[PDB]
Each structure stands twice: as structure tokens, then as C-alpha cells.
């Protein structure tokens, strides 16, 4: 996570932040799995910078994403 944080923070120039894999990280079910933690932490990293969440024209409708 630290490596990725510095990677994103340093190259804020040509990095198309990819969703539709962060999404599946926190789009889990089965409330007995610490598996959406990775997606939450990745979104927290991307939000630690000034990077907009969900960058609309990259996939899923905002409704399902944020739900």
C-alpha cells in the first residue's frame, strides 16, 4: 500500500486511475470476510491525493459503484 501510495502521489500526470478492479475489491458479500478492506484502503489511497473518485467515463454507473 505504501509503494502504491507514493507511486500515485508521484506520477499524478498520466495515471488513469483504474476502477472496475477497485470496485470488485469492495463489491464483495458474505459479512464474514475481511476482503473489502483492500478496496477500501485502495480508495483511501487514491483519495489521499486530490484524485476524483470514480472518474465517470470508466465503467459502472455511479449509482451501483457508490451503493
From Swiss-Prot:
Top-level division of the source organism's lineage: Eukaryota
Gene label: PRKDC
TM region(s), chain numbering: none
Subcellular location: Nucleus; Nucleus, Nucleolus; Cytoplasm, Cytosol
Protein name as annotated: DNA-dependent protein kinase catalytic subunit
PTM section of the record: Autophosphorylated at two clusters, the T2609 cluster and the S2056 cluster. Autophosphorylation induces a conformational change that leads to remodeling of the DNA-PK complex, requisite for efficient end processing and DNA repair.
Disease cited in the entry: Immunodeficiency 26 with or without neurologic abnormalities: A form of severe combined immunodeficiency characterized by reduced or absent T and B cells, recurrent candidiasis, and lower respiratory tract infections. Some patients show dysmorphic features, severe growth failure, microcephaly, seizures, and impaired neurological functions.
Reported function: Serine/threonine-protein kinase that acts as a molecular sensor for DNA damage. Involved in DNA non-homologous end joining (NHEJ) required for double-strand break (DSB) repair and V(D)J recombination. Must be bound to DNA to express its catalytic properties. Promotes processing of hairpin DNA structures in V(D)J recombination by activation of the hairpin endonuclease artemis (DCLRE1C). Recruited by XRCC5 and XRCC6 to DNA ends and is required to (1) protect and align broken ends of DNA, thereby preventing their degradation, (2) and sequester the DSB for repair by NHEJ.
Modified residue annotations for N6-acetyllysine: 25
The organism's taxonomic lineage, starting at the top: Eukaryota, Metazoa, Chordata, Craniata, Vertebrata
Family recorded in the similarity comment: Belongs to the PI3/PI4-kinase family.
Subunit organization: DNA-PK is a heterotrimer of PRKDC and the Ku dimer (composed of XRCC6/Ku70 and XRCC5/Ku86). Formation of this complex may be promoted by interaction with ILF3. Component of the core long-range non-homologous end joining (NHEJ) complex (also named DNA-PK complex) composed of PRKDC, LIG4, XRCC4, XRCC6/Ku70, XRCC5/Ku86 and NHEJ1/XLF. Additional component of the NHEJ complex includes PAXX. Following autophosphorylation, PRKDC dissociates from DNA. Interacts with DNA-PKcs-interacting protein (KIP) with the region upstream the kinase domain.
